[PDB]
Amino acid sequence: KIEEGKLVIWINGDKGYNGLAEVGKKFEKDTGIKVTVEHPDKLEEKFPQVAATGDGPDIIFWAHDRFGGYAQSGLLAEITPDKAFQDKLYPFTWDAVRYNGKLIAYPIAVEALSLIYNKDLLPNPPKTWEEIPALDKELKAKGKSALMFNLQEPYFTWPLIAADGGYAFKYENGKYDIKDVGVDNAGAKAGLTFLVDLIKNKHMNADTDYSIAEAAFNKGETAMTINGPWAWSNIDTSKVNYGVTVLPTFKGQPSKPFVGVLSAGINAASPNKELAKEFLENYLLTDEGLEAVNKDKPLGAVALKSYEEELAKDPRIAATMENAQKGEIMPNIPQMSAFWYAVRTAVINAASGRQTVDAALAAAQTNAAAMATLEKLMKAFESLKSFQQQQQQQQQPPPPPPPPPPPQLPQP
Amino acid sequence: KIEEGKLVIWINGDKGYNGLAEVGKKFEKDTGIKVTVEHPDKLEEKFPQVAATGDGPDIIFWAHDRFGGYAQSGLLAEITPDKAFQDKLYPFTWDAVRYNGKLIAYPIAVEALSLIYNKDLLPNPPKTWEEIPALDKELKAKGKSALMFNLQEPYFTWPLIAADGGYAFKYENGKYDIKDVGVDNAGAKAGLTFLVDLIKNKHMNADTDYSIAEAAFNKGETAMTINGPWAWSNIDTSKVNYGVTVLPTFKGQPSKPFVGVLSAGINAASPNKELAKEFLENYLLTDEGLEAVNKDKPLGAVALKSYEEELAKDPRIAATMENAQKGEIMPNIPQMSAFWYAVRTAVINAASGRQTVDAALAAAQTNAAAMATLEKLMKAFESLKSFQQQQQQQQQQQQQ
Amino acid sequence: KIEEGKLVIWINGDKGYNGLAEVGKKFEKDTGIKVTVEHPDKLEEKFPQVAATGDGPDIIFWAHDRFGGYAQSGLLAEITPDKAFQDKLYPFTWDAVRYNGKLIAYPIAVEALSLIYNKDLLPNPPKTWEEIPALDKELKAKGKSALMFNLQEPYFTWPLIAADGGYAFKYENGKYDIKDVGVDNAGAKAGLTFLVDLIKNKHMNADTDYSIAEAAFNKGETAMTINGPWAWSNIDTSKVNYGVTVLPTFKGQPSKPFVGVLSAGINAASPNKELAKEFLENYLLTDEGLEAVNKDKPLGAVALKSYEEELAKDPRIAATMENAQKGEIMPNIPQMSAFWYAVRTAVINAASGRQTVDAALAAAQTNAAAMATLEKLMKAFESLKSFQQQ
Ligand SMILES: [Ca+2]
Ligand SMILES: [Ca+2]
Ligand SMILES: [Ca+2]
Ligand SMILES: [Ca+2]
Ligand SMILES: [Ca+2]
Ligand SMILES: [Ca+2]
Ligand SMILES: [Zn+2]
Ligand SMILES: [Zn+2]
Ligand SMILES: [Zn+2]
Ligand SMILES: [Zn+2]
Ligand SMILES: [Zn+2]
Ligand SMILES: [Zn+2]
């Protein structure tokens, strides 16, 4: 059982669930139908469990990439807008919501890293990456630095690498290319080279993590950081005089950061397929639907053009969206996890001297590719161990030289 | 014994081997050549060991699907009939015996599932699936259900899943796009959904199997069942007045049942290749040859067009042919082993509430691909270890 | 080590590093840039350890076959000899030094198996495989056999199996289609059928390894052997009147040896990529350059035309080049190892009578396309669980 004649929605408790419920109210008052919004724990964990017995929420709200696996398990119902409607959203957000060519979620809001500079010690920010070292001569010479951001994690380093032509997978004709990794090429190489050069030239540090990186900007210690929206509130506290903007060009190229997208999926097991659509198209994805949620907890930049323009009047929001256009969507496939991991150790070793640029990046391509094949066999092993006859664990691994065979046979 | 100079044939007990032994006789007149016929045991299991070391029969009769295995391993000789012999048989039986384009065996009998119904409870078969819920009440109102058959096995339940777009792997060119599985499409989805309803609406029981369903039908308890021509003999015995017909359409579409073709192949090792060809092409696949084998043990439909027409005079045989002319030829590849269990699972989850249709069905495809490539890599690794110690124990140790 | 404004070269201990060293002495004269030839142990093992931290020599000498792996690990630089200079080397050698479009090395020398025959027993060697049974029972009449060579290793047997149509992987674009394995076809089937026929008519023995074969020939027991230029020095010592010639044809088709190439590669981490190529293009890959190296030890046949034509005045060397020209350049890809032992097993079972040609030949294909991706999963385990954690 799910509902029937009523809507039950799921959204992460950290979001504007209060503001959303009031749209469910405007909706009960317009159609006479009850909207119950819920905020459970590990819902992104619980969902695939219950949705799979035919249960859970009618609608679900989450970052888009987690949906790849949902839509894969066949958990999301394919959605049905007219062309006239899709024209109301920045068209690239539509890219964030398709799988084997099928649209599977409504895209709510948009996340991306931007460039954050302390307006006090840097009134004008660098328009390109290549200025930053030479500018360090200035700032290091008043006992300050020019830039500091997390180096322990690829998500942060990736906008530079990708800039010159680097890329995860070839998204092309509404479809990803799982052989075409693009992390070995010309652009990724020069990208990671620059990044390592700075850590050799001593413009940066390789044990720079999150705690370490964030602090320094918050204490007017470095002029710039790279980070996304989720970070604002803490700079706000610090009292540090700040601004937010486009990412500096590298080799005349825009930096290409990874875009995450809040999305609204419809449970494939929902009786109320028609109502939910109705709620999302006609009530939520409206200026007052979004302005509503946004009031409870701000959304970053929004998907709806109309409301983006009204919201864009924040220089900080303006940047977030501008960068998010200049960026690449983040893939919702299985393969993505392996990539992350391989590129982590790529940059760890390259920046630690451990390995050269040209070699480590090539390793990530081949080292991360050998895992995608390994990950599906691991799922094949547990399915042949399952039955083969929400706790819940979980023998797990490891494998090696195990079986097994099959059964017997019928006949007569 | 590498055969040599004479013809030895393998084949199975459940077949008319004496009627074939009689074809070995007639042949022996005009060439003088002696055809022995052995009906050994698990000769789908002996043949790959005997013919590993150049031995076994010159020829083997078995179902086509097993031959892709033989054929793959390199065990069967590519055969060469001309244009003119080829048109003696339903061209569709030909794609049943191609491996990577090469014709590789001889087509004999054709096997498909059929609609089997009690003319006494029900005078008239439904051309349609949609109307089965309706029929059930008419019948259950007189202490009788409309339709019962094995729900546990995917091979029985496949035809409705297949009906509207479903397929194991895609065929395009005498070859099988193994990356083109289609149990996730809407067709499969629709068909599975429909069956699942029939179960939840108590028009059917999920614990229904071959035993129960064959029995219920044979005790005049359910107006209909789905079975193949193997079970015809029990229904005669039941003294139930049965008839057999084409399977019901779904969404206007014919049911798509898995086809099996009885097939004869030539040991890639056989010294007697020219011999065997003349025997089958000129003595067996003649109206009289099949007759003999059939008069011994019946064959169901046969690929030989002209004796096939004489057999359609039995209405039951006529519909086995109709059911199969519309069916999905059963694949002979490795990823078929895989595909069965994945579907066996999905269908059972879907029938039990365990999972939803879209889900249960959006797994097998992923599980089969992973289960197949798992099967192909683990047993090659096992064959690597097997012949590694078989070449070191008696060969490397032999020196002791 | 690691380098910086001077050159350092590695090349295996058993080669003309002295000639090579004395080219350094010439180069250093017109430049003032010191070259250093070192030949450390297991250098094909160590180089990928140290090229991987931005270290090792500036330039590396080893057979093209191991360079696949280096380039694939991003370890060597791309090389850009202009079109005029590629023209100086035999065109087909350039194929041995290309990896996914990229030119990754300079060919030097060429190696391949050849027919070595005893002149005293065999004034004139056969052009044909098929007449060897004739030849053998002509010879068994004087207690001598026609041919003995290494049957336990595919490298030696392949040239026959390949002769009528076999191939490892398909090549037709500086790229090796690895789903296209050609060990399952008519050519190779028959090519194996014949070899196996020889063995079961006693016209040849099943257990013939390398030594048995070297001995048999080196003590004039057998008229012919198949071997490469490495065997030569011992048939000098064995004092046998001997000839190195073209391999016999089969079903009218050139026998197809596997071709190996000594190649010179630049560390992608090398700070002197310019000099490196100036050295190689203007000092080493010149008559005098090779002449010198070739003097310390013979290179065999050489990838450079002009000086190749000088060495081809020696019939043995010329026959190496012609066999080389009719053979299969060796795949440098990873699926090549997987190729090897599978064909090693195919033969050993077909030749043992344990399996038919067709069964064994098809079984190798299952192993070739399975052990190749199993090695990819091997790297997915070790080089991940180790450096990953932990
Ligand atoms: Ca609840
Ligand atoms: Ca087994
Ligand atoms: Ca069955
Ligand atoms: Ca017998
Ligand atoms: Ca008749
Ligand atoms: Ca040194
Ligand atoms: Zn909560
Ligand atoms: Zn600097
Ligand atoms: Zn307003
Ligand atoms: Zn009903
Ligand atoms: Zn040494
Ligand atoms: Zn003979």
Coordinates of C-alpha atoms in Angstrom, one line a residue, chain A:
Chain A
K1 CA 0.0 0.0 0.0
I2 CA 1.0 3.6 -0.8
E3 CA -2.1 5.9 -0.6
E4 CA -4.8 6.3 -3.4
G5 CA -6.8 9.6 -3.5
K6 CA -4.1 11.3 -1.6
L7 CA -0.4 12.4 -1.9
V8 CA 2.4 11.4 0.4
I9 CA 5.8 13.1 -0.3
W10 CA 9.3 12.5 0.9
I11 CA 12.0 15.1 1.3
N12 CA 15.2 15.4 3.3
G13 CA 14.6 17.1 6.7
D14 CA 17.4 19.6 6.1
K15 CA 15.4 21.1 3.1
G16 CA 12.4 23.4 3.1
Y17 CA 9.9 20.7 4.0
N18 CA 7.8 23.2 6.0
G19 CA 7.5 25.5 2.9
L20 CA 6.6 22.5 0.7
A21 CA 3.8 21.3 3.0
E22 CA 2.1 24.7 2.7
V23 CA 2.1 24.1 -1.1
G24 CA 0.5 20.8 -0.2
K25 CA -2.0 22.9 1.7
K26 CA -2.8 25.3 -1.1
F27 CA -3.2 22.1 -3.0
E28 CA -5.7 20.5 -0.6
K29 CA -7.6 23.7 -0.6
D30 CA -7.6 23.8 -4.4
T31 CA -8.4 20.2 -5.2
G32 CA -9.6 18.8 -1.8
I33 CA -6.7 16.3 -1.7
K34 CA -4.4 15.7 1.3
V35 CA -0.6 16.2 0.9
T36 CA 1.5 14.7 3.7
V37 CA 5.2 15.6 3.6
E38 CA 7.7 13.3 5.4
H39 CA 11.3 13.6 6.5
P40 CA 12.6 10.1 7.6
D41 CA 16.2 9.0 8.1
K42 CA 18.3 7.5 5.4
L43 CA 15.2 7.9 3.2
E44 CA 17.5 7.6 0.2
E45 CA 18.2 4.3 1.9
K46 CA 14.7 3.3 2.9
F47 CA 13.1 4.3 -0.4
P48 CA 14.6 1.6 -2.6
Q49 CA 13.6 -1.0 0.0
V50 CA 9.9 -0.2 0.2
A51 CA 9.4 1.2 -3.3
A52 CA 10.4 -2.3 -4.3
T53 CA 7.5 -4.0 -2.4
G54 CA 5.2 -1.4 -3.9
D55 CA 5.3 1.0 -1.0
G56 CA 6.7 4.3 0.2
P57 CA 6.0 7.9 -1.0
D58 CA 4.1 9.0 -4.1
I59 CA 6.7 11.6 -4.7
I60 CA 10.4 11.7 -3.7
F61 CA 12.8 14.7 -3.5
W62 CA 16.6 14.2 -3.8
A63 CA 19.8 15.1 -5.7
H64 CA 19.5 13.7 -9.2
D65 CA 22.3 11.2 -9.4
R66 CA 20.9 9.0 -6.7
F67 CA 18.0 8.5 -9.1
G68 CA 20.1 6.8 -11.8
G69 CA 20.1 3.7 -9.5
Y70 CA 16.4 4.1 -8.7
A71 CA 15.3 4.4 -12.3
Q72 CA 17.7 1.5 -13.0
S73 CA 15.9 -0.7 -10.5
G74 CA 12.7 0.4 -12.3
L75 CA 11.5 2.5 -9.4
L76 CA 10.6 5.8 -11.0
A77 CA 7.6 6.3 -13.3
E78 CA 8.5 8.0 -16.6
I79 CA 7.2 11.6 -16.6
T80 CA 5.0 13.3 -19.3
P81 CA 5.3 17.1 -19.8
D82 CA 4.3 19.1 -23.0
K83 CA 7.1 20.9 -24.8
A84 CA 5.5 24.1 -23.7
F85 CA 6.2 23.3 -20.1
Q86 CA 9.8 22.2 -20.4
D87 CA 10.5 25.5 -22.0
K88 CA 10.0 27.1 -18.5
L89 CA 13.2 25.6 -17.1
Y90 CA 16.9 26.0 -18.0
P91 CA 17.0 23.3 -20.7
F92 CA 20.2 21.7 -19.4
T93 CA 18.5 20.7 -16.1
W94 CA 16.5 18.3 -18.3
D95 CA 19.8 16.6 -19.0
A96 CA 20.2 15.9 -15.3
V97 CA 16.9 13.9 -15.3
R98 CA 16.9 11.3 -18.1
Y99 CA 18.0 7.6 -18.1
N100 CA 18.1 5.3 -21.2
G101 CA 16.5 8.3 -22.8
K102 CA 13.5 8.5 -20.4
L103 CA 12.7 11.6 -18.3
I104 CA 12.2 10.3 -14.7
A105 CA 12.2 13.3 -12.4
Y106 CA 11.1 17.0 -12.2
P107 CA 14.2 19.1 -11.5
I108 CA 13.8 21.5 -8.6
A109 CA 17.0 23.4 -7.6
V110 CA 20.7 23.5 -8.7
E111 CA 24.0 23.1 -6.8
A112 CA 27.5 24.1 -8.0
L113 CA 30.8 25.4 -6.6
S114 CA 31.6 29.0 -7.1
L115 CA 34.6 31.3 -6.4
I116 CA 34.6 33.0 -3.0
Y117 CA 36.9 36.0 -2.3
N118 CA 37.4 38.3 0.7
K119 CA 36.4 41.7 -0.8
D120 CA 38.7 43.3 1.8
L121 CA 42.1 42.0 0.7
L122 CA 40.9 41.3 -2.8
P123 CA 38.5 43.9 -4.2
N124 CA 38.8 42.5 -7.7
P125 CA 39.1 38.7 -8.2
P126 CA 41.3 37.1 -10.8
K127 CA 39.5 36.5 -14.2
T128 CA 41.9 33.6 -15.0
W129 CA 43.9 30.9 -13.1
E130 CA 47.3 31.9 -14.4
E131 CA 47.3 35.3 -12.6
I132 CA 46.9 33.7 -9.2
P133 CA 50.6 32.5 -8.8
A134 CA 52.1 35.8 -9.8
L135 CA 49.5 37.5 -7.5
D136 CA 50.7 35.2 -4.7
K137 CA 54.0 37.2 -4.7
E138 CA 51.9 40.2 -3.6
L139 CA 49.9 38.4 -0.8
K140 CA 52.5 36.0 0.5
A141 CA 54.4 39.2 1.0
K142 CA 52.0 40.5 3.6
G143 CA 51.8 37.2 5.4
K144 CA 48.7 36.1 3.5
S145 CA 47.9 33.6 0.7
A146 CA 45.9 34.0 -2.5
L147 CA 43.9 30.7 -2.6
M148 CA 43.0 27.6 -0.5
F149 CA 40.5 24.8 -1.1
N150 CA 40.1 21.1 -0.3
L151 CA 42.7 19.0 -2.1
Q152 CA 41.8 15.6 -0.4
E153 CA 38.7 15.4 -2.7
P154 CA 38.3 15.3 -6.5
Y155 CA 34.9 17.1 -6.6
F156 CA 36.9 20.2 -5.8
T157 CA 39.9 19.7 -8.0
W158 CA 37.8 18.4 -10.9
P159 CA 36.6 21.9 -12.2
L160 CA 40.2 22.7 -13.2
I161 CA 41.1 19.3 -14.6
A162 CA 37.9 19.3 -16.7
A163 CA 38.4 22.9 -17.9
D164 CA 40.7 22.2 -20.8
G165 CA 38.8 19.2 -22.3
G166 CA 38.8 16.7 -19.4
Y167 CA 35.5 14.9 -18.7
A168 CA 34.1 11.8 -17.0
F169 CA 32.0 10.2 -19.8
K170 CA 30.8 11.1 -23.2
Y171 CA 27.3 12.3 -22.7
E172 CA 26.0 12.5 -26.3
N173 CA 22.5 12.1 -27.9
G174 CA 20.7 11.9 -24.4
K175 CA 23.1 9.0 -23.6
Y176 CA 26.3 8.5 -21.8
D177 CA 29.3 6.7 -23.3
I178 CA 30.7 4.2 -20.7
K179 CA 33.9 3.5 -22.6
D180 CA 34.6 7.1 -23.5
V181 CA 36.2 8.3 -20.3
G182 CA 38.0 11.6 -21.0
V183 CA 40.5 11.9 -18.2
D184 CA 43.7 10.9 -20.1
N185 CA 43.5 13.6 -22.8
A186 CA 45.4 16.9 -23.4
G187 CA 43.1 19.0 -21.2
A188 CA 43.1 16.8 -18.1
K189 CA 46.9 16.6 -18.4
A190 CA 47.6 20.3 -18.5
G191 CA 44.9 20.8 -15.9
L192 CA 46.5 18.5 -13.3
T193 CA 49.9 19.8 -14.3
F194 CA 49.0 23.4 -13.4
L195 CA 47.5 22.1 -10.1
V196 CA 50.7 20.2 -9.2
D197 CA 52.9 23.1 -10.4
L198 CA 51.3 25.3 -7.8
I199 CA 52.0 22.8 -5.0
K200 CA 55.6 22.6 -6.3
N201 CA 55.9 26.4 -6.7
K202 CA 54.5 26.5 -3.1
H203 CA 51.3 28.5 -3.9
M204 CA 49.4 25.6 -2.2
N205 CA 49.6 22.6 0.2
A206 CA 48.6 18.9 -0.3
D207 CA 47.4 18.1 3.2
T208 CA 44.9 20.9 2.8
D209 CA 41.5 19.3 3.5
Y210 CA 38.1 20.6 4.5
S211 CA 38.4 21.7 8.1
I212 CA 41.8 23.3 7.2
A213 CA 40.7 24.9 4.0
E214 CA 37.4 26.5 5.2
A215 CA 38.9 27.9 8.4
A216 CA 41.5 30.1 6.6
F217 CA 39.0 32.0 4.5
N218 CA 36.7 32.5 7.5
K219 CA 39.7 34.1 9.2
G220 CA 40.7 36.5 6.3
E221 CA 43.9 34.4 5.9
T222 CA 43.6 33.5 2.3
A223 CA 42.0 35.8 -0.3
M224 CA 40.0 33.2 -2.1
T225 CA 38.4 29.8 -1.7
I226 CA 36.4 27.5 -3.9
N227 CA 33.2 26.2 -2.4
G228 CA 29.5 25.8 -2.9
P229 CA 26.3 27.4 -1.4
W230 CA 26.1 25.0 1.6
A231 CA 29.1 26.9 2.9
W232 CA 27.7 30.5 3.1
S233 CA 26.1 30.3 6.6
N234 CA 29.5 29.7 8.2
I235 CA 31.3 32.6 6.4
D236 CA 28.2 34.6 7.5
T237 CA 29.0 33.8 11.1
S238 CA 32.7 34.7 10.7
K239 CA 31.9 38.3 9.8
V240 CA 34.4 38.1 7.0
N241 CA 33.6 40.6 4.1
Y242 CA 32.9 38.3 1.2
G243 CA 31.7 37.9 -2.4
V244 CA 30.9 35.0 -4.8
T245 CA 31.5 34.7 -8.5
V246 CA 32.4 32.9 -11.7
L247 CA 35.3 30.6 -11.8
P248 CA 38.5 32.0 -13.3
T249 CA 39.3 30.8 -16.9
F250 CA 42.1 28.3 -17.3
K251 CA 43.7 28.5 -20.8
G252 CA 40.9 30.9 -21.8
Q253 CA 38.5 28.1 -20.9
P254 CA 35.7 28.2 -18.4
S255 CA 36.2 26.0 -15.4
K256 CA 33.7 23.1 -15.6
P257 CA 32.3 22.2 -12.2
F258 CA 30.0 19.3 -11.3
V259 CA 26.3 20.2 -11.1
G260 CA 24.0 18.5 -8.6
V261 CA 20.2 18.9 -9.0
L262 CA 17.4 18.5 -6.5
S263 CA 14.8 16.5 -8.2
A264 CA 11.2 15.2 -7.7
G265 CA 10.7 11.6 -8.8
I266 CA 7.4 9.8 -8.9
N267 CA 7.2 6.3 -7.4
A268 CA 6.5 3.8 -10.2
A269 CA 4.1 2.2 -7.8
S270 CA 1.9 5.2 -7.2
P271 CA -1.9 5.0 -7.8
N272 CA -1.8 8.8 -7.9
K273 CA 0.5 9.2 -10.9
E274 CA -1.9 11.8 -12.3
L275 CA -2.3 13.9 -9.1
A276 CA 1.4 14.0 -8.3
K277 CA 2.2 15.3 -11.8
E278 CA -0.6 17.8 -11.2
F279 CA 0.9 18.9 -7.9
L280 CA 4.4 19.3 -9.2
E281 CA 3.6 21.0 -12.6
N282 CA 0.7 23.2 -11.4
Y283 CA 1.5 24.0 -7.8
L284 CA 5.1 23.4 -6.8
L285 CA 7.1 24.4 -9.9
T286 CA 5.4 27.8 -9.7
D287 CA 7.0 31.0 -8.5
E288 CA 5.0 30.8 -5.3
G289 CA 5.6 27.1 -4.9
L290 CA 9.3 27.6 -5.1
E291 CA 9.4 31.0 -3.4
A292 CA 7.5 29.0 -0.7
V293 CA 10.1 26.2 -0.1
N294 CA 12.9 28.7 -0.6
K295 CA 11.7 30.7 2.4
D296 CA 12.1 27.8 4.8
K297 CA 15.6 26.9 3.6
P298 CA 17.1 28.7 0.6
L299 CA 17.5 26.6 -2.6
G300 CA 20.7 28.0 -4.1
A301 CA 19.8 28.8 -7.7
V302 CA 16.5 27.5 -9.1
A303 CA 15.5 25.5 -12.2
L304 CA 12.5 27.7 -13.1
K305 CA 13.6 30.6 -15.4
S306 CA 10.9 32.9 -14.2
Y307 CA 11.8 32.6 -10.6
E308 CA 15.5 32.4 -11.2
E309 CA 15.5 36.0 -12.6
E310 CA 13.7 37.3 -9.5
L311 CA 16.1 35.3 -7.4
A312 CA 19.2 36.1 -9.5
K313 CA 19.3 39.5 -7.9
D314 CA 21.7 37.9 -5.4
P315 CA 25.3 38.3 -6.8
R316 CA 26.0 35.0 -4.9
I317 CA 23.0 33.2 -6.5
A318 CA 23.9 34.8 -9.9
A319 CA 27.4 33.3 -9.7
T320 CA 26.1 29.8 -8.6
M321 CA 23.8 29.6 -11.7
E322 CA 26.4 31.2 -14.0
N323 CA 29.0 28.6 -13.0
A324 CA 26.4 25.9 -13.2
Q325 CA 25.8 26.7 -16.8
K326 CA 29.6 26.7 -17.4
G327 CA 29.7 23.3 -15.8
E328 CA 28.9 19.7 -16.5
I329 CA 26.0 17.7 -15.0
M330 CA 27.1 14.9 -12.6
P331 CA 26.3 11.4 -14.0
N332 CA 23.8 9.2 -12.3
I333 CA 25.3 5.9 -13.4
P334 CA 26.9 3.0 -11.5
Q335 CA 30.3 3.7 -13.1
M336 CA 30.5 7.0 -11.4
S337 CA 31.6 5.7 -8.0
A338 CA 34.6 3.9 -9.4
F339 CA 35.6 7.1 -11.3
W340 CA 35.4 9.1 -8.1
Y341 CA 37.7 6.7 -6.3
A342 CA 40.2 6.3 -9.1
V343 CA 40.4 10.1 -9.6
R344 CA 40.9 10.5 -5.8
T345 CA 44.0 8.4 -5.8
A346 CA 45.0 10.0 -9.1
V347 CA 45.2 13.5 -7.5
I348 CA 46.4 12.2 -4.1
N349 CA 49.5 10.6 -5.7
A350 CA 50.1 13.3 -8.4
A351 CA 50.1 16.1 -5.9
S352 CA 52.1 14.1 -3.3
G353 CA 54.9 13.5 -5.9
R354 CA 54.4 9.8 -5.5
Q355 CA 53.5 9.6 -9.2
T356 CA 53.9 11.9 -12.3
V357 CA 51.0 13.7 -13.9
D358 CA 50.8 11.8 -17.2
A359 CA 51.0 8.4 -15.5
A360 CA 48.6 8.8 -12.6
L361 CA 45.8 10.2 -14.8
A362 CA 46.3 7.3 -17.2
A363 CA 46.0 4.9 -14.2
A364 CA 42.7 6.5 -13.1
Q365 CA 41.4 5.8 -16.6
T366 CA 42.5 2.2 -16.6
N367 CA 42.4 1.7 -12.9
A368 CA 38.9 3.1 -12.7
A369 CA 37.7 1.1 -15.7
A370 CA 38.8 -2.3 -14.3
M371 CA 36.4 -1.7 -11.4
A372 CA 33.1 -1.0 -13.3
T373 CA 33.3 -4.6 -14.6
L374 CA 34.3 -5.8 -11.1
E375 CA 31.3 -4.0 -9.5
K376 CA 28.6 -5.7 -11.6
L377 CA 30.1 -9.2 -11.0
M378 CA 30.0 -8.4 -7.2
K379 CA 26.3 -7.8 -7.7
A380 CA 26.0 -11.0 -9.7
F381 CA 27.7 -12.9 -6.9
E382 CA 25.3 -11.7 -4.2
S383 CA 22.3 -12.4 -6.4
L384 CA 23.5 -15.9 -6.9
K385 CA 23.9 -16.1 -3.1
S386 CA 20.6 -14.4 -2.2
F387 CA 17.8 -16.8 -3.1
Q388 CA 19.4 -18.9 -4.4
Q389 CA 17.6 -20.6 -1.5
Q390 CA 15.3 -3.2 6.3
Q391 CA 17.6 -5.1 8.6
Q392 CA 20.0 -5.9 7.4
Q393 CA 23.4 -7.6 6.9
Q394 CA 25.1 -8.9 5.2
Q395 CA 27.9 -11.5 4.8
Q396 CA 29.2 -9.4 2.0
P397 CA 32.7 -10.5 0.7
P398 CA 35.2 -11.3 -0.1
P399 CA 35.2 -13.5 -3.2
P400 CA 38.1 -15.5 -5.0
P401 CA 37.8 -19.0 -6.3
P402 CA 34.1 -19.8 -5.3
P403 CA 31.3 -21.4 -7.4
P404 CA 28.7 -22.4 -7.8
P405 CA 27.0 -24.6 -10.4
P406 CA 23.2 -24.8 -11.2
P407 CA 20.5 -27.4 -10.4
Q408 CA 19.2 -30.5 -12.2
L409 CA 16.4 -30.4 -14.7
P410 CA 12.8 -31.5 -15.4
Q411 CA 12.1 -33.7 -18.5
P412 CA 9.1 -36.0 -18.7

